Amino acid sequence: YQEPTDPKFPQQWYLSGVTQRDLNVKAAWAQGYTGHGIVVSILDDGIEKNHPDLAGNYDPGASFDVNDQDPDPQPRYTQMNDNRHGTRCAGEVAAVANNGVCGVGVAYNARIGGVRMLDGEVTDAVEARSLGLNPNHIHIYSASWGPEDDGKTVDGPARLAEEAFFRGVSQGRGGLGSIFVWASGNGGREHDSCNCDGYTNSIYTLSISSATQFGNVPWYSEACSSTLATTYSSGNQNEKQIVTTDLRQKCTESHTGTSASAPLAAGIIALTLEANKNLTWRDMQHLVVQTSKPAHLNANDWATNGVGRKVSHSYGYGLLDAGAMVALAQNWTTVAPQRKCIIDILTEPKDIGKRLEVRKTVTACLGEPNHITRLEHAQARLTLSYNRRGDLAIHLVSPMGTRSTLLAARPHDYSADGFNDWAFMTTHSWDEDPSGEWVLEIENTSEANNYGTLTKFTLVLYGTASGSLVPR
Ligand SMILES: Clc1cc(Cl)cc(-c2cc(CN3CCN(c4ccncc4)CC3)cc(CN3CCN(c4ccncc4)CC3)c2)c1
Ligand SMILES: *[C@@H]1O[C@H](CO)[C@@H](O)[C@H](O)[C@H]1NC(C)=O
Ligand SMILES: [Ca+2]
Ligand SMILES: [Ca+2]
Ligand SMILES: [Ca+2]
Ligand SMILES: [Cl-]
Ligand code: NA
Numbered sequence: 166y167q168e169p170t171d172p173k174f175p176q177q178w179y180l181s182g183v184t185q186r187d188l189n190v191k192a193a194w195a196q197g198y199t200g201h202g203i204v205v206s207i208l209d210d211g212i213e214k215n216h217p218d219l220a221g222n223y224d225p226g227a228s229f230d231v232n233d234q235d236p237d238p239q240p241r242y243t244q245m246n247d248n249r250h251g252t253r254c255a256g257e258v259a260a261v262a263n264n265g266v267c268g269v270g271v272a273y274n275a276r277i278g279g280v281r282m283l284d285g286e287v288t289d290a291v292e293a294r295s296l297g298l299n300p301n302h303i304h305i306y307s308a309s310w311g312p313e314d315d316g317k318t319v320d321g322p323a324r325l326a327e328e329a330f331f332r333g334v335s336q337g338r339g340g341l342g343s344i345f346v347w348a349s350g351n352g353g354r355e356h357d358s359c360n361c362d363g364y365t366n367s368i369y370t371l372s373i374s375s376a377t378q379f380g381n382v383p384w385y386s387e388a389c390s391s392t393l394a395t396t397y398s399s400g401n402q403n404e405k406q407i408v409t410t411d412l413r414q415k416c417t418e419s420h421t422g423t424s425a426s427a428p429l430a431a432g433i434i435a436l437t438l439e440a441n442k443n444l445t446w447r448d449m450q451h452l453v454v455q456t457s458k459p460a461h462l463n464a465n466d467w468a469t470n471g472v473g474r475k476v477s478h479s480y481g482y483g484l485l486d487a488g489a490m491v492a493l494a495q496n497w498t499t500v501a502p503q504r505k506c507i508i509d510i511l512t513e514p515k516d517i518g519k520r521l522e523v524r525k526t527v528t529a530c531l532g533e534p535n536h537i538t539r540l541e542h543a544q545a546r547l548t549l550s551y552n553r554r555g556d557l558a559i560h561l562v563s564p565m566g567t568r569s570t571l572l573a574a575r576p577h578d579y580s581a582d583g584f585n586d587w588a589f590m591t592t593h594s595w596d597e598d599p600s601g602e603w604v605l606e607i608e609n610t611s612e613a614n615n616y617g618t619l620t621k622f623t624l625v626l627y628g629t630a631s632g633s634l635v636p637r
């Protein structure tokens with residue numbers, strides 16, 4: 166195997182590193198996997214389809230302009246180069262290799278398109294037409310953005326976009342399911358908590374956070390239990406950043422944020438899908454859980470879950486490992502059909518006050534076709550009133566003892582509107598047996614005399630009843 170000769174490939178430290186602080190992508194390339202036959206689409210502000218490092222891989226069938234309602238996602242050029250982000254993300258996935266231009270994509274033989282959707286009013290319909298673009302041609306969708314990362318917003322897909330997610334994972338990709346890769350958010354300096362973003366908090370999105378070059382949680386990162394894994398991105402001014410294609414046929418070394426991590430994950434997923442085209446949308450999440458690596462990622466919340474895997478709310482299961490992903494994909498056995506066990510917990514409304522604990526012992530649909538002994542995602546769907554939402558912190562403890570933070574205190578969130586059946590999701594109990602006692606904790610983290618009521622707590626368990634590995 167000959168590594169790429171592109172002039173900035175040596176600067177792509179998160180791929181070309183020889184110091185074990187990288188995504189282990191050369192190992193996948195050397196196994197023969199470069200993304201051939203895989204189609205990825207960037208949902209963003211457009212794609213410079215004539216970029217010298219993108220044109221060779223550009224796919225019109227992976228592209229559309231839902232802002233202006235035409236097939237051509239070319240960005241709108243402005244003096245400030247506002248609409249450059251989709252071009253940066255496209256190159257992360259699939260910049261051409263060995264062509265003397267810039268660097269390379271993770272999946273440098275994949276086909277790449279873009280949906281121009283963010284350069285205009287983003288409506289539910291715009292979102293749905295983007296998520297649902299050509300779902301039997303595009304394999305993988307990469308989305309780096311969502312509701313405002315101001316640390317006070319609670320919002321998610323409205324009806325058309327949610328329908329697009331379910332149609333995507335159910336009938337997309339020949340029934341194997343569209344793979345939606347999502348950035349978990351850039352709201353760290355606002356103390357944002359990313360389960361409040363219903364796109365990344367979805368089970369249907371494979372959510373990705375960031376690590377800095379020296380292995381730290383970047384200033385912009387949001388912690389939450391819905392995140393699955395991590396890719397490198399930017400940090401402080403002594404740490405390197407992401408090197409990729411830029412608007413106006415240029416090359417940037419200063420692409421940043423969690424919004425730069427999701428495209429790198431999308432490229433690794435493209436390599437993995439080349440290694441096994443029969444993987445389902447859930448298979449792909451299982452592979453990420455099993456192969457991602459905590460080592461050398463610094464956080465104070467690494468915890469071992471019930472099946473022996475380390476998990477963090479900043480990093481999920483750790484750094485994506487492309488070589489391990491493609492290796493495990495090759496002989497992967499398709500997971501069993503997804504079961505869903507619905508457990509309505511409360512028999513009466515519960516005053517929250519300063520602190521509320523709700524304990525319930527469940528059988529996880531014992532005796533029924535939705536019996537789950539092997540958890541995937543779990544949700545605590547909560548309906549509650551509170552006078553100042555951001556003073557709440559919420560935790561969910563599984564029978565195996567795994568404490569998931571569902572909501573951290575958000576100091577800017579002054580809302581008096583509470584949560585209306587909000588489906589806080591955790592990935593941290595993946596592969597655990599969910600039978601037993603679950604504990605929900607709701608706490609007022611402020612000294613104020615805050616008040617409210619929990620009126621509904623639905624525990625929703627997803628998973629299967631077969632195929633478990635010996636704990637790690
Ligand atoms: Cl599918 C998909 C893929 C992607 Cl990548 C994003 C969304 C995404 C975007 C936004 C729009 N932002 C402004 C434009 N951005 C830029 C970021 C960086 N630089 C420049 C612009 C991104 C963030 C918002 C919502 C939330 N969404 C909720 C449902 N909707 C409404 C609900 C109620 N009332 C009005 C509208 C529409 C808005 C999602 C959805
Ligand atoms: C894909 O997986 C399904 C489910 O296990 C199986 O029935 C089918 O034969 C597989 N197809 C290929 C081409 O491997
Ligand atoms: Ca256009
Ligand atoms: Ca190149
Ligand atoms: Ca956020
Ligand atoms: Cl469902
Ligand atoms: Na965001």
Ligand code: NA
Nearest residue numbers: 365367370372
């Ligand atoms: Na997700």
Ligand code: NA
Nearest residue numbers: 469470471566
């Ligand atoms: Na534990």
Ligand code: NA
Nearest residue numbers: 564599600601
């Ligand atoms: Na149990």
